[PDB]
């Protein structure tokens, strides 16, 4: 019936002087717009019909041509920048906004995913959507007492809409409606469907992407608990954004990392360090980089939960950028602990695997490294042991890398060779 129709009839239809027709021909754009190999999203923007599918979405008296124009615009909308940019500017997003209230569901979910592609286009159209007024009528489609009535589709596709409101930078999401979100994510953020809590995580993700302002309007909810149950989950696309949320919050003050800690996250991680996935076990390391760089108490928390032994794993062997993850954890442990927490760390066999990784042709983990050897001779001087360490490093090769270091192109880590080399080495 409508199956395959050239643009050229749908044309014909649209421009007919029959509201039957019209429908005929929407519904034949949306199934072309709708196919998988190549929809020809452009040829239909060329022959003007946004405006057209744009005037159809206020046509209360005929829901069946709303709905069809709508799900058209939404295949578009999600196409290029370009093709989003083309529906924003017929108009579309008012018109979309007073079909949230809509009294058909299959029409407001329309709306709803319409809403979160243009949204999630960029900072400039996510901020546009808001000015237009789209929060409230959003939230209130959540407003009921229990989240298990609703339909499920209808419920992830609000979820993934509400996250794109929360998703990109300069700017960031306006305060004011990251406080006015909050509260829905927050409870989005218990309910028991997969997909809800992935997109729920990924929203906290954004939001905690930041300064420690933006962080702290997120930890004053309460969420880093059930954050934190979140990165235990067996599902991977779970534990993918809240392994980002928690690895955010960390780069936080002391007292946001604090949290994280006293909610139980480090004891997730000895999992999480030897993850199958490669880009979890590089977010967790990253994540100890920054709890390693926190106070000697927290240094503390780390080596009681034995995470030590962990990390001396993951810098033997892992991804090479999760080695460097590792190697930044190294130094911030060796630049914040206690003489004790430094010699604890070269007992659990830190050394040699720090000296392997002087071979890496990758100039700014070589200084890492560097870095992290002084401040283990450092301890070693408070304690006349700077020799025994010495040989150690020597045992294992590691002059043989140092003394190379030395040659090698870069300013720093001639410089921080030679004293090395002069100042521990006879
Ligand atoms: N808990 C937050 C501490 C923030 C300040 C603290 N940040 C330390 C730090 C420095 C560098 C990294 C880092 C650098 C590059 C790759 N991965 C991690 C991670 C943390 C510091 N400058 O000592």
């Known amino acids: 019936g409508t199956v395959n129709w050239s643009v050229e009839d749908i044309v014909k239809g649209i421009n007919s002087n029959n509201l039957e027709s019209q ?107 808001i000015k237009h007024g789209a929060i409230d009528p959003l939230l209130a489609l959540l407003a009921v007492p229990d989240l298990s009535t609703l339909a499920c589709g209808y419920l992830r596709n609000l979820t993934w809409t509400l996250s794109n409101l929360c998703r990109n930078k300069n700017p960031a999401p306006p305060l004011d409606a990251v406080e006015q979100i909050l ?62 949320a928690i690895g955010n919050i960390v780069t936080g003050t002391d007292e946001q990392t604090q949290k994280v800690i006293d909610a139980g996250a480090l004891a997730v991680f000895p999992s999480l360090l030897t993850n199958p996935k490669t880009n979890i076990q590089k977010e967790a390391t990253w994540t100890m980089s920054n709890i390693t760089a926190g106070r000697q108490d927290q240094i503390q928390q780390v080596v009681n939960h034995g995470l030590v032994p962990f990390l001396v794993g993951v810098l033997s062997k892992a991804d090479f950028k999760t080695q ?45 490294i560097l870095d992290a050897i002084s401040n283990i001779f450092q301890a070693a001087e408070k304690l006349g042991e700077t020799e025994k360490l010495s040989i150690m490093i020597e045992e294992c090769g590691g002059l043989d890398k140092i003394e190379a270091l030395q040659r090698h192109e870069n300013e720093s880590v001639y410089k921080a060779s030679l004293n090395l080399i002069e100042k521990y080495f006879s």
């Not at 949230?100 to 286009?121: T, Y």
């Not at 028991?192 to 993700?205: F, G, H, T």
């Not at 599902?235 to 809240?242: D, F, K, W, Y």
């Not at 442990?333 to 040699?352: A, D, M």
Request: include cysteine.
């Open 183 to 244: 509260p829905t994510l927050v409870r989005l953020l218990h309910h028991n469907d997969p997909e809800v809590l992935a997109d729920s995580c990924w929203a906290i993700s954004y939001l905690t992407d930041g300064p420690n302002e933006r962080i702290e309007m997120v930890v004053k909810k309460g969420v880093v608990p059930q954050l934190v149950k979140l990165l235990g989950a067996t599902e991977l696309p779970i534990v993918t954004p809240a392994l980002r």
């Open 23 to 129: 429908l005929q021909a929407t519904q034949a754009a949306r199934k072309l717009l709708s196919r998988e190999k190549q929809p020809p999203i452009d040829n239909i923007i060329r022959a003007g019909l946004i405006p057209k599918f744009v005037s159809f979405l206020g046509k209360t008296d005929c829901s069946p041509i709303q709905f069809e124009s709508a799900w058209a615009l939404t295949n578009i909308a999600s196409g290029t920048s370009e093709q989003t940019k083309a529906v924003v500017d017929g108009g579309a997003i008012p018109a979309f906004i007073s079909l949230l209230a809509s009294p058909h569901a299959h029409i407001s979910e329309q709306a709803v995913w319409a809403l979160g592609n243009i949204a999630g286009d960029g900072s400039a159209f996510r901020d546009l959507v």
């Open 324 to 368: 460097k993850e590792a190697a930044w954890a190294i130094t911030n442990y060796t630049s914040g602990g206690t003489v004790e927490q430094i010699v604890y760390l070269v007992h659990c066999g830190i050394i040699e695997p720090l000296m392997n990784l002087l071979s890496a042709k990758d100039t700014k983990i070589i200084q890492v």
